[PDB]
Amino acid sequence: QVQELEKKWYALQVEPGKENEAKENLLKVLELEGLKDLVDEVIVPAEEKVVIRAQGKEKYRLSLKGNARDISVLGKKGVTTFRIENGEVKVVESVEGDTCVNAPPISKPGQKITCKENKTEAKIVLDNKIFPGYILIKAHMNDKLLMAIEKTPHVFRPVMVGGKPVPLKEEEVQNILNQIKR
């Protein structure tokens, strides 16, 4: 037991609706500012979902986590079937000429698979209904990290008392994470 220095959880107030962007911006800020060693985790307390569209129209909005589901939609030319399983999305089959059948599986918010020939698509998004305007970080808090957080594009500070970021116990994080699962 050496790097015993524990990182704690902190809640970051961020632009509502831009929580994923806030996370990706913070990740890049940490890289630039040389702060990655201080942070073990950055999580958006929101459920990951798969949005399936066909000809620019939403057909399904499903939980990314689940047993293993196939979904077929009618497109411009025919059927695209998408598979959602082990937290990934890929195409089983589509119309002739659709290269999306060989697209690597996607799993992170923002990613998408586009079947250009059939005009269907699967996109991974976050459902920020329960805890909008927040990301969570597990970190060693200090002055440089605090300041870097406040200068990250879609981030507006940690929850603080007297300028001191308020740590959340493991239990409370698990709790809110259990509310974005249930």
Side-chain angles (χ1 to χ4, degrees), residues 10-50:
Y10 294 96
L12 308 194
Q13 299 184 137
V14 307
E15 178 88 310
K18 298 294 178 192
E19 308 171 49
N20 190 57
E21 196 156 358
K23 164 173 176 179
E24 298 301 306
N25 286 298
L26 174 57
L27 290 180
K28 288 154 68 166
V29 158
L30 300 176
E31 167 76 43
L32 202 186
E33 235 83 280
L35 291 177
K36 300 187 295 177
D37 202 52
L38 303 199
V39 179
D40 281 353
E41 202 135 355
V42 183
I43 293 171
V44 180
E47 188 180 1
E48 300 185 320
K49 290 197 166 171
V50 187

Side-chain angles (χ1 to χ4, degrees), residues 1-180:
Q1 176 62 283
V2 287
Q3 285 301 168
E4 55 225 14
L5 289 179
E6 71 159 346
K7 300 190 182 57
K8 295 181 175 198
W9 284 99
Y10 294 96
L12 308 194
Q13 299 184 137
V14 307
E15 178 88 310
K18 298 294 178 192
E19 308 171 49
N20 190 57
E21 196 156 358
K23 164 173 176 179
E24 298 301 306
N25 286 298
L26 174 57
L27 290 180
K28 288 154 68 166
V29 158
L30 300 176
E31 167 76 43
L32 202 186
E33 235 83 280
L35 291 177
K36 300 187 295 177
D37 202 52
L38 303 199
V39 179
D40 281 353
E41 202 135 355
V42 183
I43 293 171
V44 180
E47 188 180 1
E48 300 185 320
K49 290 197 166 171
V50 187
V51 177
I52 296 176
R53 294 183 196 270
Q55 306 198 75
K57 177 162 192 173
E58 163 174 339
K59 314 296 282 188
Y60 294 90
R61 185 173 293 268
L62 311 172
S63 154
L64 174 63
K65 228 269 70 191
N67 291 157
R69 290 197 60 181
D70 275 7
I71 177 63
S72 293
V73 291
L74 274 179
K76 173 197 169 175
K77 297 194 170 198
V79 182
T80 303
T81 296
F82 298 91
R83 170 156 303 170
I84 304 178
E85 35 180 357
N86 291 144
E88 282 181 344
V89 186
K90 56 180 175 281
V91 175
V92 178
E93 92 290 326
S94 201
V95 304
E96 177 170 31
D98 245 339
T99 63
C100 67
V101 304
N102 301 130
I106 60 164
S107 63
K108 297 167 288 182
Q111 297 201 107
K112 71 175 195 180
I113 290 177
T114 296
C115 299
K116 168 183 80 166
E117 191 70 9
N118 206 30
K119 294 204 174 314
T120 55
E121 59 163 292
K123 198 174 197 198
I124 296 174
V125 306
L126 295 171
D127 171 353
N128 272 128
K129 180 178 180 309
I130 306 169
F131 301 109
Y134 286 93
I135 68 176
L136 299 170
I137 66 173
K138 198 196 181 103
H140 182 272
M141 192 57 64
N142 67 179
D143 287 358
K144 190 164 171 167
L145 177 59
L146 204 190
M147 293 298 113
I149 285 170
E150 298 177 357
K151 289 172 179 288
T152 303
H154 299 297
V155 180
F156 181 47
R157 49 92 144 167
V159 169
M160 292 174 283
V161 165
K164 306 191 182 165
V166 180
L168 306 168
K169 70 311 298 156
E170 187 62 32
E171 185 175 4
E172 185 174 19
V173 177
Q174 195 166 170
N175 175 208
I176 86 98
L177 285 185
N178 279 177
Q179 185 173 173
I180 320 165

